[PDB]
Scaffold this active site. Structure first.
Site, PDB file in Angstrom:
ATOM      1  N   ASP A  65       0.869  -1.165   0.000  1.00 27.17           N
ATOM      2  CA  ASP A  65       0.000   0.000   0.000  1.00 27.17           C
ATOM      3  C   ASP A  65       0.926   1.242   0.000  1.00 27.17           C
ATOM      4  OD1 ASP A  65      -1.086  -2.279   1.944  1.00 27.17           O
ATOM      5  OD2 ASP A  65      -2.972  -1.211   1.423  1.00 27.17           O
ATOM      6  N   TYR A  67       2.897   4.845   0.728  1.00 30.49           N
ATOM      7  CA  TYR A  67       3.326   5.517   1.992  1.00 30.49           C
ATOM      8  C   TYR A  67       2.198   6.322   2.653  1.00 30.49           C
ATOM      9  CZ  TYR A  67       8.201   4.840   0.468  1.00 30.49           C
ATOM     10  OH  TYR A  67       9.447   4.264   0.081  1.00 30.49           O
ATOM     11  N   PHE A  78       7.062   2.873  -3.663  1.00 30.24           N
ATOM     12  CA  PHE A  78       8.330   3.086  -2.921  1.00 30.24           C
ATOM     13  C   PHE A  78       9.056   4.343  -3.253  1.00 30.24           C
ATOM     14  CE2 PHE A  78       7.436  -1.399  -2.875  1.00 30.24           C
ATOM     15  CZ  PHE A  78       7.399  -1.665  -1.549  1.00 30.24           C
ATOM     16  N   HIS A 188       8.837  -7.912   3.123  1.00 30.25           N
ATOM     17  CA  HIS A 188       8.751  -6.542   2.684  1.00 30.25           C
ATOM     18  C   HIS A 188       9.891  -5.737   3.268  1.00 30.25           C
ATOM     19  CE1 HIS A 188       6.910  -2.536   2.673  1.00 30.25           C
ATOM     20  NE2 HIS A 188       6.059  -2.996   1.776  1.00 30.25           N
TER      21      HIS A 188
HETATM   22  O1  LIG Z   1       4.217  -1.510   0.337  1.00 32.67           O
HETATM   23  C1  LIG Z   1       4.610  -0.313   0.185  1.00 32.67           C
HETATM   24  N1  LIG Z   1       5.235   0.291   1.188  1.00 32.67           N
HETATM   25  C2  LIG Z   1       5.720   1.535   1.065  1.00 32.67           C
HETATM   26  C3  LIG Z   1       5.530   2.241  -0.089  1.00 32.67           C
HETATM   27  F1  LIG Z   1       5.986   3.438  -0.269  1.00 32.67           F
HETATM   28  C4  LIG Z   1       4.820   1.584  -1.198  1.00 32.67           C
HETATM   29  O2  LIG Z   1       4.607   2.202  -2.279  1.00 32.67           O
HETATM   30  N2  LIG Z   1       4.425   0.334  -0.989  1.00 32.67           N
HETATM   31 CL   LIG Z   2       8.415   3.051   5.086  1.00 31.78          CL
END
Ligand SMILES: O=c1[nH]cc(F)c(=O)[nH]1
Ligand SMILES: [Cl-]
Length: 224
Positions: A65, A67, A78, A188
């Site tokens: 998901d 940020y 990310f 993750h």
């Molecule tokens: O799983 C996620 N964590 C953090 C993030 F920024 C993202 O886009 N996805």
């Molecule tokens: Cl993070």
């Protein structure tokens, strides 16, 4: 709105089977605003990953998901804007694994757009979040959209490597069961999961080896 006004044309064709669901999501998001609940990233960035060409995707990265902190999510999983510091913890962890795997210097900034320009789709399972509330749009309807996206990629039957980061891996692997598709998983890169198997997972070189094995060109992962 036709999807062709929101996303690249190859993606608009690939996602037409979920066009109503994407419209439903836009209605949901507007209702959240009307009720005083914001979302992230910005509306014009929600579908940003789908603005790079469907036909050019060679590597799919799938996170959970976006940020949850305002000023971080940009619609590429990310990634952050080039002026953002500190980098978010997941991104810092990604970059340590990047240097460990590839031997490159740390990137200058947290902007992953070069990867997106080079055929890396920076997807999340769920494409919005309420600020300060991690994973708060789970179960709200994005899942059908991202399942269509993933399956459509797989159905091209072009070389594709999927890098699956986190708890959706077991759900997503069956969607990638197709010729010329390979899925590799790890924990993750977030603060409290990264040290449980993200680090040492070497996804960047692995993806390149798998691509070359299939006769595709590797990704130039080098960030400025
Ligand atoms: O799983 C996620 N964590 C953090 C993030 F920024 C993202 O886009 N996805
Ligand atoms: Cl993070």
């Amino acid at each position: 709105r036709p999807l062709s006004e929101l996303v690249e044309r190859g993606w608009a064709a690939a996602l037409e089977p979920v066009a109503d669901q994407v419209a439903h999501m836009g209605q949901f998001l507007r209702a959240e605003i009307a009720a005083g609940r914001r979302y992230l990233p910005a509306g014009s960035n929600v579908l940003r990953a789908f603005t790079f060409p469907f036909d050019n995707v060679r590597v799919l990265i799938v996170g959970q998901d976006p940020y949850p902190t305002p000023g971080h999510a940009v619609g590429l999983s990310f990634s952050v804007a080039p002026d953002v510091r500190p980098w978010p913890r997941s991104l810092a962890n990604i970059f340590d694994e990047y240097t460990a795997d590839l031997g490159y210097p740390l990137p200058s900034n947290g902007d992953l757009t070069p990867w997106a320009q080079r055929g890396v789709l920076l997807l999340n399972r769920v494409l919005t979040v309420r600020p300060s509330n991690p994973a708060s749009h789970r179960g709200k309807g994005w899942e059908a959209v991202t399942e269509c996206a993933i399956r459509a990629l797989a159905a091209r039957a072009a070389p594709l490597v999927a890098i699956l980061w986190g708890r959706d891996a077991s759900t997503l692997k069956p969607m990638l069961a197709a010729g010329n598709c390979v899925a590799i998983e790890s924990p993750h890169p977030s603060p409290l999961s990264a040290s449980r198997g993200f680090f040492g997972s070497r996804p960047f070189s692995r993806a390149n080896e798998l691509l070359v094995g299939m006769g595709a060109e590797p990704i130039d992962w080098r960030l400025p």
